[PDB]
């Protein structure tokens, strides 16, 4: 383990070598304006990550900064890209933790990995931990058919997430998690996540801005009506629109003859294909040839949960 | 290691210096067998397996050789460690005590040598008594799934050492889950008894034996408190007595008096009786750890496989 | 290490001080083989394997060479650690008593050396019998899930060494957990049954020989009322009858005064018929016959009687 | 250790005085040369790998590559060890032997020098042949997690000293527990099957030699009514018939008085067919067939058989 600011060092003597290596294995050029929508998530990230770095004397007492957030929504919207954006546009060390880091063959290794992760995240910096897919890691605690190790990992998170009784020497840690199934969390771990917020499917203006953003650099015509492309994708997710743009951009390759030309007249014709722009008929064919990952009953269930038990 | 009776000496050389320290760590007249109420069968078996081969040893020979094992079983609050302390206090035998924690070591071949040294010292010293508490661990059938290898050799050493010189040992055990015992180990335990919850009359004697000594009022009706429990576990009656004795401190509000005049208020409270209001407000507060399915399972097992 | 016939001595100077001490620590109270009721085929195999090569050592030369192994498998309490003591009693051969606590070996590379020295010493004293008790431990499957790197070496040394005569018994409660090669080297696998309605009458009339019985001559009734007793429980039945002869006279109160003749008055009292009812209504068999049925199934599908 | 052929002497003063004494104790018989009644391919490979390059030494050289290894696998009843003992007592090569015990030591640094001294002795003495019995306990998986650090150096010195005259040979019972790099150095992994209906008849006709037998027994019925027997169970059956000849009479009830006359009358009598019927009635096979199919699958997948 490398050193931190002010030249100190970490005494990891009471742990073995593979635990230290398994934690050290989980340790640019984006921005927060690349995320269309999601105003309240940017608000909580603003008043919990980048404002205490500038004016730390204001956040004291009842205005202590938050140390939890869970982004629970339908599986198409942007829930990992916002975490990568707040990892890129910051100055704090980042810890990505999935469910297959905290797993081992022996007895009593997952709790030591979680303990070492939180101790390094407190020691190194005002850091931030991103636990992706929390529903495979913190489940329920009294269900039938769970092993005797997942319950100890849940108890480790429940004990470690609060704490720090000494009010002096306060170092910052901020836990962030993404979920598709938000009714599958333990209540004592759901309580530890303040600011549980919902991330919705994009509206008309969000889809219009996303089509306007994703079609820069690629040469297009001047006869594309963005209002028809906004109003015809009624029900598309935030990730299907980039798929629609990609199919409309390779439809200009499927329009010409490269399947008939075998070898000859193929690489000599690819040199002049790079200048051909994208007209309306390619978007019509791509809109006919792409269907959304529908079934809005899960969006309805997630929205009703975030409206009953949510905190924004 | 001390020297036993008749001035002999034990030559413990092949064993390491920490096995002998552990067995030495396993090794009064405070109590007596009249303090425990109920349990007639256990007192009878202890009387004709520990006491009577000391007075008349020319009678227990041949077919009438004395017993060599016993295991008690029942609900988890009815008294089966108190009988072990009573027979430790009212005897002249080097009383051992062994739990499931001082048979453990992370080296290969130290969990089955502690047991061998234990039985060799119990033979060497005296007509000893071994008392293994919570024997449901170090039990369990050997054809089980997910059983570690050394916990099989511990049971094998227990199985070899417990049958076979006029040197007497008496292995005594106690458990709450008796159906999870080994198959070839509940054969060696020659007397498997059941100890129930107290009946309608034993609870009155337990109330009297707890509340003797403490100054009480002369109008406490013992019959109503005896018939009003109806399912108490035997330890919950003593807990009821402690709650009804501390309620006379919780009646005078001593939460704000501190330093000044508090130290005389406890002297004024030390001569105050335990009236009927204390027992009513203690009966409204204490409930047993019920769910008598454990008692019914122990009754069915000790009535289908128990040798009283 | 003592000497043998013709005064030779073993050159055990290539072994440590505690290994030879263990093998010497694992190395004649007169019982009789006709003091065991039942098991005719077991006594037949023991006869042909131990007693007859001593009398006529010329009949066993080629194909008729004597047997080299045996396994007694069955329920607990049926008399498996009694025939080993009987054949240790009435023989001139050198006995042995190996177990699983005798091969602890906290160091590395010592348990296989103890096994090798055990067989190399049993082949020194020329008639020898080795009795491995409860070979379930240290006799599991060679490719099991949770095993060390020393238990497999112990099993491999048993497989190598079992290929001047020895004779190896065994005893098991759970015979299906044995190996394949180690099950193969045991040339005789014999089931031990629970006693029938004829053997129990013989067993109670053998066990009650000292204490005076008077009128309970209904031994057919007393052997017909016990349905599934496992052999070692009817001895507890007779013992409970004798202690019930004690229990009828309340001796808890008599303290000090004439405790020598009052128990002499319990030395002339006879075991009446009232005692066996109060001994049958307080003693139950320790098991149900699931392990008995499974042992019978395994010895019918794999037993070479 | 003695000297060798052609007048040389070994200088083993670099190693300690007990490594020589513990590897010397592995280096005049009439063992069965032709009396192995199967496996013509194994006899072909051994006769082309040890004798024909040592009778005419230019018959197998260079591009005509002589062999260097063999890993026999199969069920636990067939004859793997007998071929090693036959090629031991047949040819004129210093037959070594390696167990799992001769490669273990309590000290550190003495578990690797034994293999080096062994291969140096084998390449110094003669065109030797090593028979590492039960190699699935010696060499397991290298880079595991529940493995002590003492076995990796043993397998490393083994693979570094494998390149070497010396013709190594080994036999297993569990072949899939071998290392993935170990099978590359084994130039032949031959499967050894259980004998069919043609081989059991020759097995009975060879194993019933020297014993007076009646001329009514039919070897085809005995060869066809043992569907499932391994190699050893047929020899156990031939033993059980000749012992049933003894147990037909009454020798347990009588003893002492003129028993050698009755024993001479027993030696006079001969084996009928009812003795074979009683022997086949009460002998079961050693193990139910699953490991035979699993080793056939392993030799079909990775082996050259």
């Amino acid at each position: 383990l490398p050193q931190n600011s002010a030249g100190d060092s970490f005494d990891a003597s009471a742990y073995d070598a593979y635990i230290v290596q398994a934690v050290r294995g989980t340790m640019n050029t984006m921005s927060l304006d690349d995320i269309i929508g999601m105003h309240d998530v940017k608000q909580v990230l603003h008043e919990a990550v980048t404002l205490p770095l500038l004016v730390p004397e204001f956040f004291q007492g009842l205005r202590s900064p938050w140390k939890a957030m869970v982004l629970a929504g339908p599986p198409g919207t942007g829930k990992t890209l916002i975490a990568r954006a707040i990892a890129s546009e910051s100055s704090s060390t980042f810890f990505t933790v999935s469910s297959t880091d905290l797993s081992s063959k022996w007895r009593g290794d997952s709790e030591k990995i979680v303990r070492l992760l939180f101790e390094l995240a407190r020691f190194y910096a005002p850091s931030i931990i991103f636990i992706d897919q929390i529903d495979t890691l913190g489940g329920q605690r009294g269900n039938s058919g769970e092993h005797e190790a997942s319950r100890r990992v849940k108890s480790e998170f429940l004990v470690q997430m609060d704490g720090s009784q000494n009010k002096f020497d306060s170092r910052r840690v901020f836990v962030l998690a993404a979920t598709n199934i938000p009714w599958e969390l333990d209540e004592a771990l759901r309580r530890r996540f303040e600011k549980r917020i919902f991330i919705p499917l994009p509206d008309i203006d969000a889809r219009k801005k996303l089509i306007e953003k994703s079609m820069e650099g690629t040469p297009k015509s001047d006869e594309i009506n963005y209002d028809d492309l906004a109003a015809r994708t009624e029900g598309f997710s935030g990730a299907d629109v980039v798929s629609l743009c990609r199919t409309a951009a390779i439809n200009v390759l499927r329009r010409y003859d490269t399947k008939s030309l075998r070898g000859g007249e193929l690489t000599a014709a690819m040199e002049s294909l790079k200048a051909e722009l994208v007209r309306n008929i390619d978007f019509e064919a791509a809109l006919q040839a792409v269907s959304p990952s529908a079934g809005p009953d899960t969006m309805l269930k997630c929205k009703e949960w975030c409206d009953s038990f949510g905190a924004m | 290691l001390p020297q036993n009776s008749a001035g002999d000496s034990f030559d413990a050389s092949a064993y390491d210096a920490y096995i002998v320290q552990a067995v030495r760590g396993t090794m009064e007249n405070t109590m007596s067998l009249d303090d425990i109420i109920g349990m007639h069968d256990v007192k009878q078996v202890l009387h004709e397996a520990v006491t009577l081969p000391l007075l008349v040893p020319e009678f227990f020979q041949g077919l009438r050789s004395p017993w060599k094992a016993m295991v008690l079983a029942g609900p988890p609050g009815t008294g089966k460690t108190l009988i072990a302390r009573a027979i430790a206090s009212e005897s002249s035998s080097t009383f051992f005590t062994v739990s499931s924690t001082d048979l453990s070591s992370k080296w290969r071949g130290d969990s089955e040598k502690i047991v061998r040294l234990l039985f060799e010292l119990a033979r060497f010293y005296a007509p000893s008594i071994i008392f293994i508490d919570q024997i449901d661990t170090l039990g369990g059938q050997r054809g089980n799934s997910g059983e570690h290898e050394a916990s099989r050799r511990v049971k094998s050493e227990f199985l070899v050492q417990m049958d076979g010189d006029s040197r007497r040992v008496f292995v005594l055990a106690a458990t709450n889950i008796p159906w999870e015992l080994d198959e070839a180990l509940r054969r060696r335990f020659e007397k498997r008894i059941f100890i129930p919850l107290p009946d309608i009359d034993a609870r009155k004697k337990l109330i009297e034996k707890s509340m003797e000594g403490t100054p009480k009022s002369d109008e406490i009706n013992y019959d109503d408190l005896a018939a009003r429990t109806e399912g108490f576990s035997g330890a919950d009656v003593v807990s009821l007595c402690r709650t009804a004795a501390i309620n006379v401190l919780r009646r005078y509000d001593t939460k704000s008096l501190r330093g000044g005049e508090l130290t005389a208020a406890m002297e004024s409270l030390k001569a105050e009786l335990v009236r009927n209001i204390d027992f009513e407000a203690a009966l409204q507060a204490v409930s047993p750890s019920a769910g008598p399915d454990t008692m019914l399972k122990c009754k069915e097992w000790c009535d289908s496989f128990g040798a009283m | 290490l003592p000497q043998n016939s013709a005064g030779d001595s073993f050159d055990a100077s290539a072994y440590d001080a505690y290994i030879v001490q263990a093998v010497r620590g694992t190395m004649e109270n007169t019982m009789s083989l006709d003091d065991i009721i039942g098991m005719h085929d077991v006594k037949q195999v023991l006869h042909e394997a131990v007693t007859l090569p001593l009398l006529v050592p010329e009949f066993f030369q080629g194909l008729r060479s004597p047997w080299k192994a045996m396994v007694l498998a069955g329920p607990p309490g049926t008399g498996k650690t009694l025939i080993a003591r009987a054949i240790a009693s009435e023989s001139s051969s050198t006995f042995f008593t190996v177990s699983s606590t005798d091969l602890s070996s906290k160091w590395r590379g010592d348990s296989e050396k103890i096994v090798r020295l055990l067989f190399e010493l049993a082949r020194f004293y020329a008639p020898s019998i080795i009795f491995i008790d409860q070979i379930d431990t240290l006799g599991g499957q060679r490719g099991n899930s949770g095993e060390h790197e020393a238990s497999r070496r112990v099993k491999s040394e048993f497989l190598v060494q079992m290929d001047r005569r020895v004779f190896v018994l065994a005893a098991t409660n759970i015979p299906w957990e044995l190996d394949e090669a180690l099950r193969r080297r045991f040339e005789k696998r014999i089931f031990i049954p629970l006693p029938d309605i004829d053997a129990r009458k013989k067993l109670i009339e053998k066990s009650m020989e000292g204490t005076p019985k008077s009128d309970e001559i209904n031994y057919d009734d007393l052997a017909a009322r016990t349905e599934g007793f496992s052999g070692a429980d009817v001895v507890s039945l007779c013992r409970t009858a004798a202690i019930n002869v004690l229990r009828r006279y309340d001796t808890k109160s008599l303290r000090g005064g004439e405790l020598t003749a009052a128990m002499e008055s319990l030395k002339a009292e006879l075991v009446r018929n009232i005692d066996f009812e109060a001994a049958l209504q307080a003693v139950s068999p320790s098991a149900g016959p699931d392990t008995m049925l499974k042992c019978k199934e395994w010895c019918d599908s794999f037993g070479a009687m | 250790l003695p000297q060798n052929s052609a007048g040389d002497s070994f200088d083993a003063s670099a190693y300690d005085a007990y490594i020589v004494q513990a590897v010397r104790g592995t280096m005049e018989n009439t063992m069965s040369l032709d009396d192995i009644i199967g496996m013509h391919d194994v006899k072909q490979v051994l006769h082309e790998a040890v004798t024909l390059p040592l009778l005419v030494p230019e018959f197998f050289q260079g591009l005509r590559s002589p062999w260097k290894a063999m890993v026999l696998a199969g069920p636990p009843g067939t004859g793997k060890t007998l071929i090693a003992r036959a090629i031991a007592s047949e040819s004129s090569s210093t037959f070594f032997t390696v167990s799992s015990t001769d490669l273990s030591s309590k000290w550190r640094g003495d578990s690797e020098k034994i293999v080096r001294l062994l291969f140096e002795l084998a390449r110094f003495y003669a065109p030797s042949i090593i028979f590492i019995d039960q190699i699935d306990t010696l060499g397991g998986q290298r880079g595991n997690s529940g493995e002590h650090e003492a076995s990796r150096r043993v397998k490393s010195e083994f693979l570094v000293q494998m390149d070497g005259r010396v013709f190594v040979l080994a036999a297993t019972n569990i072949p899939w527990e071998l290392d993935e790099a170990l099978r590359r150095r084994f130039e032949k992994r031959i499967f050894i099957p259980l004998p069919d209906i043609d081989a059991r008849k020759k097995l009975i006709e060879k194993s019933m030699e020297g014993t007076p037998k009646s001329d009514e027994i039919n070897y085809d019925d005995l060869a066809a009514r043992t569907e499932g027997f391994s190699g050893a169970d047929v020899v156990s059956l031939c033993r059980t018939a000749a012992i049933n000849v003894l147990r037909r009479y009454d020798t347990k009830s009588l003893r002492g008085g003129e028993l050698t006359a009755a024993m001479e009358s027993l030696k006079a009598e001969l084996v009928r067919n009812i003795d074979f019927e009683a022997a086949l009635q009460a002998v079961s096979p050693s193990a139910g067939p699953d490991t035979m199919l699993k080793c056939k699958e392993w030799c079909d997948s990775f082996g050259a058989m």
Partner: peptide, 14 residues
Amino acid sequence: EEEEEEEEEEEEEE
């Protein structure tokens, strides 16, 4: 001249 001993682990499974 050093010696070597043998420890015991404990692994789990489902």
